[PDB]
Amino acid sequence: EVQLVQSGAEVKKPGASVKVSCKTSGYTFTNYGINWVRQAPGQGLEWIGYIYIGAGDTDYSEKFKGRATITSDTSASTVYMELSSLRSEDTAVYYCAGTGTRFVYWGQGTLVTVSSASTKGPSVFPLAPSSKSGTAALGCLVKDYFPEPVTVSWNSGALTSGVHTFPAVLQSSGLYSLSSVVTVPSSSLGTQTYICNVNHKPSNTKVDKKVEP
Amino acid sequence: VQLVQSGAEVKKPGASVKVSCKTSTFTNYGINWVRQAPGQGLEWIGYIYIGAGDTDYSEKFKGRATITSDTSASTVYMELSSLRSEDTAVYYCAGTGTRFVYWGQGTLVTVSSASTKGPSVPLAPTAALGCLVKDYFPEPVTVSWNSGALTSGVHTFPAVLQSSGLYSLSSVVTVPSSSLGTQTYICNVNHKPSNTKVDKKVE
């Protein structure tokens, strides 16, 4: 089977440079052109460049001027994309397309995160029901944490039904923010006590905030 | 040159959807059709070249998918038949052209047996406010605070589909605690598929 395996995810600081690799196993053809494309977290895709393995002809877009350099190793059948002088605006998943003119095969995508931060424990904020909440909703927002992940449980994992933890968003600052909400019968609110257990293993900090009005 | 794709679609299983890529013509271009499932990787449906005129398809979509080009002017279309839940992804058109490959914005095609529901939207305690959206079909929901006025400290997180078949969403804004009591905070949630806009005031 023909598959394209890209390199692992890398977190880089602004002004740094990242080189991503796409190897292609199962294709022993001398015609093996790879196309580079990046998708920003909310945006759609956009082209970076193209390289053909034997003749070695490379081509970049108007966006990247000299921060885009695609290279290839015929022996190891790996193609590499290097993006230099990174900015925070370069945070995206870089895919490699496959075989040639038609994008028949795709790589799993390598996520590159450009952030100026280093490591932060999150500040969790308890969100209790408002004056208009028979179901009521409870939250803890996990604000300002770098990098991921963060695991959030309610009542030490005792409470699972109705608990939804939404995907993290990297802010402009370079920090992740997250929210965890749980919908619970409102009758329970006075007697049942609820705590949002947030764990950020990268910083070794585990905060348990109790939610109540 | 820019490739402009058709609007987002919501269809029921077994239906057919035809997506289009208008361009700034596409003669001698080579348009590929690719779909991305949510959060997942990319998948190729087919390719059509105008001059060579060879249409190529993926064995996965060779029967259900058909790619065509407009007769007059220039426009490319992808129609996929016998829709399934599993076909829910963003369809992307990519035009090679002359030494640049231009991408379309992408079109979201949602395929669920599920039927349109408006959101059930308040969360109160610098403090942190936001209102959490409950089960709602389909997916485009737009949240703002104070009718676009409050855009500082507002973070609206991506939706999550449930076993229910419905999406739930979260919008949180962090505001100075001094303001509570003087500043009034209303979240405006607009779910256009339902023709519904809820304004829930939070304290």
Residue numbers in the entry:
A (entry chain A): 1 to 133, 137 to 216
B (entry chain B): 2 to 25, 28 to 124, 126 to 129, 138 to 215
Task: Kindly provide excerpts from the paper associated with this entry.
Herein, we structurally and biophysically characterized unexpectedly occurring human heavy- chain only antibodies arising directly from transient CHO expression. We found these non- artefactual HC-only antibodies to be homodimeric in nature, with an extended interface joining both CH1 and VH domains, and to be linked by a conserved intermolecular disulfide bond similar to how Fabs are linked. Further, these HC-only molecules have similar or better accelerated storage stability characteristics and thermal stability compared to their mAb or Fab counterparts. Unlike mAbs or Fabs, these HC2 species are expressed efficiently, independent of the LC, where one HC domain seemingly mimics the LC during assembly.
To understand the structural basis of HC dimer formation and the nature of HC dimerization, crystallization studies were conducted for the Fd2 domain of molecule A (Fd2-A). Crystals obtained from a sparse matrix screen diffracted to 2.9 Å and the structure was solved by Molecular Replacement (See Table 5 for crystallographic statistics). The final model consists of six monomers of 215 residues each that form three homodimers of HC:HC in the asymmetric unit. In the crystal structure, the three molecules within the asymmetric unit are structurally similar but have distinct and different domain orientations. The final electron-density map allowed the positioning of most residues with confidence. In Figure 6B, the Fd2-A structure is shown in ribbon diagram and reveals a highly symmetrical homodimer. The CDR loops are also highlighted and face outward, similar to how CDR loops are positioned in Fabs/mAbs. The electron density corresponding to residues HC-216 to 224 is very weak, indicating that the loop is disordered. This disordered loop also includes Cys219, which is engaged in an intermolecular disulfide bond to itself in the opposing monomer based on previous studies of HC dimers and our disulfide mutagenesis experiments. Here in the case of molecules A and B, HC dimer formation occurs with or without the presence of LC, implying that perhaps one Fd domain mimics the LC, and can promote folding of another Fd domain presumably associated to BiP. Remarkably, as depicted in Figure 6D, the novel HC2 or Fd2 complex reported herein overlays nicely with a representative Fab structure with a low overall Cα RMSD of 1.10 Å, revealing that the opposing HC, or Fd, likely mimics the LC structurally during assembly and promotes complete folding and assembly of HC2s/Fd2s. Hydrogens bonds are apparent between the side chains of residues HC-CDR2-A-Asp-59 and HC-CDR3-B-Arg-102 (3.4 Å distance), as well as HC-CDR3-A-Arg-102 and HC-CDR2-B-Asp-59 (3.4 Å distance).
